[PDB]
Enzyme design. Sequence first.
Site, PDB file in Angstrom:
ATOM      1  N   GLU A   1       0.853  -1.175   0.000  1.00 54.97           N
ATOM      2  CA  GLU A   1       0.000   0.000   0.000  1.00 54.97           C
ATOM      3  C   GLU A   1       0.894   1.232   0.000  1.00 54.97           C
ATOM      4  OE1 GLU A   1      -3.272   0.145  -0.175  1.00 54.97           O
ATOM      5  OE2 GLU A   1      -3.891  -1.928   0.149  1.00 54.97           O
TER       6      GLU A   1
ATOM      7  N   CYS B   1      -2.498   9.279   2.735  1.00 56.66           N
ATOM      8  CA  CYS B   1      -2.188   8.682   1.478  1.00 56.66           C
ATOM      9  C   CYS B   1      -3.242   8.947   0.426  1.00 56.66           C
ATOM     10  CB  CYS B   1      -2.094   7.198   1.696  1.00 56.66           C
ATOM     11  SG  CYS B   1      -3.666   6.593   2.265  1.00 56.66           S
TER      12      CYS B   1
HETATM   13  N1  LIG Z   1      -2.054   2.825   0.645  1.00 52.92           N
HETATM   14  C1  LIG Z   1      -2.127   3.018   1.939  1.00 52.92           C
HETATM   15  O1  LIG Z   1      -2.683   2.233   2.645  1.00 52.92           O
HETATM   16  C2  LIG Z   1      -1.487   4.242   2.499  1.00 52.92           C
HETATM   17  C3  LIG Z   1      -2.213   5.087   3.309  1.00 52.92           C
HETATM   18  C4  LIG Z   1      -1.659   6.228   3.828  1.00 52.92           C
HETATM   19  C5  LIG Z   1      -0.281   6.590   3.567  1.00 52.92           C
HETATM   20  N2  LIG Z   1       0.417   5.658   2.715  1.00 52.92           N
HETATM   21  C6  LIG Z   1       1.797   5.934   2.366  1.00 52.92           C
HETATM   22  O2  LIG Z   1       2.657   6.010   3.493  1.00 52.92           O
HETATM   23  C7  LIG Z   1       3.798   6.806   3.166  1.00 52.92           C
HETATM   24  C8  LIG Z   1       4.444   7.662   4.290  1.00 52.92           C
HETATM   25  O3  LIG Z   1       4.571   7.002   5.538  1.00 52.92           O
HETATM   26  P1  LIG Z   1       5.957   6.538   6.183  1.00 52.92           P
HETATM   27  O4  LIG Z   1       6.923   7.661   6.214  1.00 52.92           O
HETATM   28  O5  LIG Z   1       5.766   5.927   7.516  1.00 52.92           O
HETATM   29  O6  LIG Z   1       6.539   5.460   5.154  1.00 52.92           O
HETATM   30  P2  LIG Z   1       8.001   4.855   4.991  1.00 52.92           P
HETATM   31  O7  LIG Z   1       9.030   5.931   4.989  1.00 52.92           O
HETATM   32  O8  LIG Z   1       8.097   4.134   3.709  1.00 52.92           O
HETATM   33  O9  LIG Z   1       8.213   3.822   6.158  1.00 52.92           O
HETATM   34  C9  LIG Z   1       7.266   2.802   6.374  1.00 52.92           C
HETATM   35  C10 LIG Z   1       7.858   1.756   7.301  1.00 52.92           C
HETATM   36  O10 LIG Z   1       9.160   1.322   6.861  1.00 52.92           O
HETATM   37  C11 LIG Z   1      10.230   1.673   7.718  1.00 52.92           C
HETATM   38  N3  LIG Z   1      11.175   2.384   6.855  1.00 52.92           N
HETATM   39  C12 LIG Z   1      11.060   3.640   6.434  1.00 52.92           C
HETATM   40  N4  LIG Z   1      12.076   3.960   5.611  1.00 52.92           N
HETATM   41  C13 LIG Z   1      12.862   2.897   5.476  1.00 52.92           C
HETATM   42  C14 LIG Z   1      14.094   2.543   4.744  1.00 52.92           C
HETATM   43  N5  LIG Z   1      14.750   3.405   3.954  1.00 52.92           N
HETATM   44  N6  LIG Z   1      14.563   1.303   4.885  1.00 52.92           N
HETATM   45  C15 LIG Z   1      13.947   0.405   5.649  1.00 52.92           C
HETATM   46  N7  LIG Z   1      12.835   0.664   6.330  1.00 52.92           N
HETATM   47  C16 LIG Z   1      12.250   1.862   6.294  1.00 52.92           C
HETATM   48  C17 LIG Z   1       9.559   2.578   8.700  1.00 52.92           C
HETATM   49  O11 LIG Z   1      10.091   2.400   9.993  1.00 52.92           O
HETATM   50  P3  LIG Z   1      10.040   3.671  10.918  1.00 52.92           P
HETATM   51  O12 LIG Z   1       8.980   4.582  10.406  1.00 52.92           O
HETATM   52  O13 LIG Z   1       9.751   3.215  12.295  1.00 52.92           O
HETATM   53  O14 LIG Z   1      11.345   4.349  10.758  1.00 52.92           O
HETATM   54  C18 LIG Z   1       8.055   2.328   8.676  1.00 52.92           C
HETATM   55  O15 LIG Z   1       7.603   1.413   9.668  1.00 52.92           O
HETATM   56  C19 LIG Z   1       3.331   7.669   2.015  1.00 52.92           C
HETATM   57  O16 LIG Z   1       4.057   7.371   0.829  1.00 52.92           O
HETATM   58  C20 LIG Z   1       1.863   7.332   1.832  1.00 52.92           C
HETATM   59  O17 LIG Z   1       1.451   7.436   0.481  1.00 52.92           O
HETATM   60  C21 LIG Z   1      -0.170   4.563   2.206  1.00 52.92           C
END
Ligand SMILES: NC(=O)c1ccc[n+]([C@@H]2O[C@H](COP(=O)([O-])OP(=O)(O)OC[C@H]3O[C@@H](n4cnc5c(N)ncnc54)[C@H](OP(=O)(O)O)[C@@H]3O)[C@@H](O)[C@H]2O)c1
Lengths: 435, 435
Positions: free
Chosen positions: B214, B248
């Site tokens: 997602e 998102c």
């Molecule tokens: N389709 C859906 O269901 C939905 C709904 C709403 C939002 N989103 C998406 O969520 C995104 C933003 O949220 P977010 O900042 O939490 O996402 P994220 O940066 O991709 O991180 C998500 C998870 O992965 C870990 N993580 C983050 N960066 C990483 C890396 N470089 N290497 C390894 N692990 C990593 C994080 O751990 P930590 O955060 O604990 O560091 C977190 O638990 C947006 O792109 C949005 O579009 C999707």
Amino acid sequence: NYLSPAKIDSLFSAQKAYFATRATADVGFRKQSLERLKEAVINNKEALYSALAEDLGKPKDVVDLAEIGAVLHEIDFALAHLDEWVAPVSVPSPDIIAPSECYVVQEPYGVTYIIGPFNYPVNLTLTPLIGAIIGGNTCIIKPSETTPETSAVIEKIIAEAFAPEYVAVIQGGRDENSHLLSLPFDFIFFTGSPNVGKVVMQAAAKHLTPVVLELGGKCPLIVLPDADLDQTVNQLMFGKFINSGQTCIAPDYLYVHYSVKDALLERLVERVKTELPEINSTGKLVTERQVQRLVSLLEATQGQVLVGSQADVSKRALSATVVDGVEWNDPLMSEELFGPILPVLEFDSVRTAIDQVNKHHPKPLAVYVFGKDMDVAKGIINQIQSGDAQVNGVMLHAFSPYLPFGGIGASGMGEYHGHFSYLTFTHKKSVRIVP
Amino acid sequence: NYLSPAKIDSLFSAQKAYFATRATADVGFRKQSLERLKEAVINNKEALYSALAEDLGKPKDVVDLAEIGAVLHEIDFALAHLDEWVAPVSVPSPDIIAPSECYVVQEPYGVTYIIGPFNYPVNLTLTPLIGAIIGGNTCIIKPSETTPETSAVIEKIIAEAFAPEYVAVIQGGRDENSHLLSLPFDFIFFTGSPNVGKVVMQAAAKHLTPVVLELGGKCPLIVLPDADLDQTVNQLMFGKFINSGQTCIAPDYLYVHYSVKDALLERLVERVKTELPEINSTGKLVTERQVQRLVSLLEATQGQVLVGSQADVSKRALSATVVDGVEWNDPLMSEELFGPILPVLEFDSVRTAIDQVNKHHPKPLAVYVFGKDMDVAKGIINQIQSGDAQVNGVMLHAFSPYLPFGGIGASGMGEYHGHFSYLTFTHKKSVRIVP
Ligand SMILES: NC(=O)c1ccc[n+]([C@@H]2O[C@H](COP(=O)([O-])OP(=O)(O)OC[C@H]3O[C@@H](n4cnc5c(N)ncnc54)[C@H](OP(=O)(O)O)[C@@H]3O)[C@@H](O)[C@H]2O)c1
Ligand SMILES: NC(=O)c1ccc[n+]([C@@H]2O[C@H](COP(=O)([O-])OP(=O)(O)OC[C@H]3O[C@@H](n4cnc5c(N)ncnc54)[C@H](OP(=O)(O)O)[C@@H]3O)[C@@H](O)[C@H]2O)c1
């Protein structure tokens, strides 16, 4: 010989552009695409017979059942159902979001890549193609290079039915495959070995491309004390030795209750000697290398040969072979055999038999159980995770348009055939309409 | 602080063994598991209110709608239907395989892994968990590191409801995550950014692990000439600025016909400067580092600010901002904003609007269209690939259990919610019974 990377990139770009035209959106277009594939297959029957005989020594009757007939049946089934499948599905709207009208659309992915395996090259290239077509996609197909005659006919069939911007065949080896895998495809359908599936998914990750992986493992045929032994031998003969054992859903090994082993092998060995006396009775192994691989395994086994084990590498032939007294320890039980060899293991306790399958070769593509007690038989199936399963039958679940064919874990991810191919080659799109 | 790799491995190993027990088989166990989940959530709302207000500045009523209420509604929907869902489906048998009886079984994957995002940490960890549970799987959950308060409460909720051999929370950062991704999970559910989605998929490939991603993108909100401006502004206010735009399915940018752009912007800007007057009216951005990123973008914009712009990195806040006269060139139309900024672009015809969205930011998680001509509004939706879509509304499609929720391409792969969560967390196992 093969297309240069430049021409491949150029072919890929023309499919991207063609898709954005939305040419593939209407059902009328998708249906006539199926009619043109069907017509092109029928026009090339004789070339397919010769190609499959040369490549794999397939008899004409087998080609009609497992290759041509399988595809044409899926085509006809798709044609009769497509109007229903492409229709938007209206769903209820809960009060929290009222007032609104909601429904679900199945939306195409875009440009798809189909990687074809050697063993059933027509079935396993063109049946997924039907999926791509009815889903409203474009498609690039790369058949196996190890079956060159039939890959050529597959290219001829596709070229004759379709413009390259819509559906095209790109023949190639390792280099052409890795290049195509680096392109931003919108969906990838792979049929092959678990280790190459890992390579395909790894490449898919770099472009966030969804995949279906139809893989392998070792399908057990488990024989309970009350099994009809003639029925069992019949299905073993069919399942194990068709296409020289080169079938993903073939019984890889026999797991028989100790109390009917002697009676089972007596029937089996006799029928093998009677019906499969020639060194090339089963067909041809795809390469000389594969014959040599299988011969080494036979040279290393601790089991006892009961019949066969005669090989002619240059003929790409290995006789139908049965090996008794095999343990899980054995070289014949290390990997998927994909050859006309049937190792035979024994059990007493059903509970232990279940545990042994799960411990040593879990999640096969199919589990086969032979016996007359359905509770015991179904109970075995329910306690062994596998892609699919049968009681008192072999292979024929893959020839039903009503059944979702696919594995689990090391035997794969995703399913297709019938309606499931349509759902596999589209994504679900929710639509909410507020006045 | 965080669990060591040795205990993580030790925790993972115990879930494998527990799944192998077939403890999760019967539907009664699964129904009780949801009940325990529901009660654990209910018995901890106050702690959730506090944690979410602390982490992101979420109002109580927002938590009631998009967090606590969202998973409670899914739990109740699943409990009401699960008995029907888990029942094996009998299917027809074609004559070619007669005589036989065939049916489909939805079979659990095994040990699953759920990665939680920061922005809706309760919804997007417990709602997938529902699927894991009703699928008959076990589950290891790793909540976002960047929301310490809520992640700590999630752990408390999960520990209260479940033994760690069944469902367990493991808090951690990048090092804990990369170590979990190296374990042989049987299924991985990821919510987050596209680039991290690639990391997750690349790791899953090494174990042939099926994934659901997602992901993100830039959801357009497209406004036609005959749109209700009051309706349009209400939904923008609701969708764009809730949780400071960290959603998102938020309208990332506004894309409005030239003939109503001025009228719409007068209504919109007035509503923003009055309803969202303070520096922290929208809530808190997740980190100070995020604020800095958003500000820098405003520095580089070729567009004219109309309201807001003022920001305070210290208190993780940025004022609701509308930026006018933006082209696709702009630094505001490059990445996913995920902030309180609403860039505004314009078009001269429907034809060009469709083509420009597809060209510059295709396959967003959602497409929103506002207008009173349905055939035109649907026409747009049908010509822009997206995960989901709405006419004259935003966001609420994700709150219906009757609707599959998921993206396409860069916005992701796979769908869940309602029955779709059950189907996503299981695989289809064909069974053929021969007499
Ligand atoms: N389709 C859906 O269901 C939905 C709904 C709403 C939002 N989103 C998406 O969520 C995104 C933003 O949220 P977010 O900042 O939490 O996402 P994220 O940066 O991709 O991180 C998500 C998870 O992965 C870990 N993580 C983050 N960066 C990483 C890396 N470089 N290497 C390894 N692990 C990593 C994080 O751990 P930590 O955060 O604990 O560091 C977190 O638990 C947006 O792109 C949005 O579009 C999707
Ligand atoms: N689940 C199913 O539906 C199904 C059906 C049939 C077979 N199988 C499984 O397929 C396997 C046997 O067939 P196979 O020998 O054709 O499998 P394979 O070795 O994985 O080959 C499949 C395709 O991938 C190519 N390929 C092979 N090795 C590759 C590598 N290192 N890197 C990139 N591409 C590679 C092949 O190209 P070239 O062949 O042109 O060199 C071929 O086109 C068995 O494991 C069987 O169980 C599964």
